[PDB]
Amino acid sequence: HMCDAFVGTWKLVSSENFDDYMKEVGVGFATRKVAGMAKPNMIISVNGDVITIKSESTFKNTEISFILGQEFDEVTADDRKVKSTITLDGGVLVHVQKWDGKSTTIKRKREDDKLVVECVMKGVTSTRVYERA
C-alpha cells in the first residue's frame, strides 16, 4: 500500500558518477561505455506481495520479481550472478546484491516528483534521477 508511490513508468533524467560506480563494481570498459549511454525507463508494479521492477533500454532489458525480505537470484545487466534481497526500510526500497564476497546496495526513494536511485559500491555512490514518463 505504501509501495504504491513507486508504481508506474519512470524515465531517467540525470546521472552522476555512474561510470565510477561501475568501475568499482568491476564492469569492463566496453560494457561501461554502452551501459553509461543508456537512458532507461524503469517500470515498477505490484501484484499482491510480488513487486516487479523492469528496466528497459537500448543496452539491456531486465526484469526482477520478488517478495520483500526474501532472497532471490538475479543476473544483472552487466552479467553478474548475484544473490539479492530487497526490503522496505522507512519508505526506501533497499536492494542488496552479493556475489564473489562483494556487496553493493541500490536504494530507491521518492523525493518530490522524482524517484531517486542511489547505487553504492564501497565508498563510491552514483545518483540517478528518474521522473514519471
Ligand X SMILES: Cn1nc(CSc2ccc(Cl)cc2)cc1O
Annotated binding site for a fatty acid: 128-130
Is 64 a binder of ligand X (CB under 6 A)? Answer: no
Beta bridge pairs of residue 97: 84, 104
Examine residue 22 and tell whether it contacts ligand X (CB under 6 A): yes
Among 27, 44, 53, 93, binds ligand X (CB under 6 A): 27
- Rounded to a whole number of angstroms, the minimum distance from the CB of residue 90 to ligand X is 20
With CB under 6 A as the contact rule, the residue among 19, 20, 56, 78 that binds ligand X is 78
The CA distance from 10 to 101, in Å, is 32
* Distance, CA of 36 to CA of 56 (rounded, Å): 14
Residue among 88, 78, 85, 60 at smallest CA distance from 24: 78
- Chosen residue from 64, 77, 82, 88 binding ligand X by CB under 6 A: 77
Q: State yes or no: residue 51 binds ligand X (CB under 6 A).
A: no
The x, y and z cell numbers of residue 58, run together, are 537500448
Evaluate whether 14 touches 20 at the Cβ level (below 8 Å).
no
Contacts with ligand X, residue ranges (CB under 6 A): 12, 22, 25, 27, 35, 40, 55, 76-78, 117, 119, 128
